[PDB]
């Protein structure tokens, strides 16, 4: 049988955290900071997808080009298969074509 | 795994409670039970 017997430990979500109470501050530093910066230059993450939504195949062409020279050795070879698989899948398979 | 089914036990006992008066392995085993509690209804 698969279901756990005693209740789990109760979760203590500190709702008035530092991260949580001040979430979304300095959003709209464009529209009322007179257009010095951009909200897309506030996003912290991977350099290839900083303010760019993309699709699963586009998320790999951009990674293979923006950081693709400086990637790890057998991690790059993995990505070149993945582009070759998602190209073969998006342009030859599916319904609705 | 994001999103495993945590309450699978309770979809099983919704079925087996109407099969508990059967005889054989259908009063315990869900694979055999749902072919017979559906035919009972």
């Amino acid at each position: 049988i698969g279901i756990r017997l005693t209740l789990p430990p109760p979760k203590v979500v500190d709702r008035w955290n530092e991260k949580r109470a001040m979430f979304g501050v300095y959003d709209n530093i464009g529209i009322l900071g007179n257009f010095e910066k951009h909200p897309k230059e506030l996003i912290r993450g991977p350099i290839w997808l900083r303010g760019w939504k993309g699709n699963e195949l586009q998320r790999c062409i951009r990674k293979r080009k923006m950081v693709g020279s400086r990637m790890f050795a057998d991690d790059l070879h993995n990505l070149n298969k993945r582009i070759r698989y998602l190209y073969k899948h998006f342009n030859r398979h599916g319904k609705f074509r | 795994l994001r999103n495993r089914v945590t309450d699978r036990y309770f979809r099983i006992q919704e079925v087996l409670k109407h099969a508990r008066h059967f005889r054989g392995r259908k009063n315990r085993c869900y694979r055999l039970a749902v072919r017979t509690v559906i035919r009972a209804f």
């Binding site: 698969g2 279901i3 756990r4 017997l5 005693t6 209740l7 789990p8 | 495993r4 089914v5 945590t6 309450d7 036990y9 309770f10």
Partner: peptide, 26 residues
């Protein structure tokens, strides 16, 4: 271990429905 809490909470309402039948209250 699954991340559920409502599975495990609603299970021990079916352990108290199964405990008051076998060891019934006065």
């Amino acid at each position: 271990v699954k991340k559920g809490f409502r599975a495990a909470f609603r299970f021990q309402k079916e352990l108290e429905r199964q405990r008051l039948l076998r060891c019934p209250p006065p």
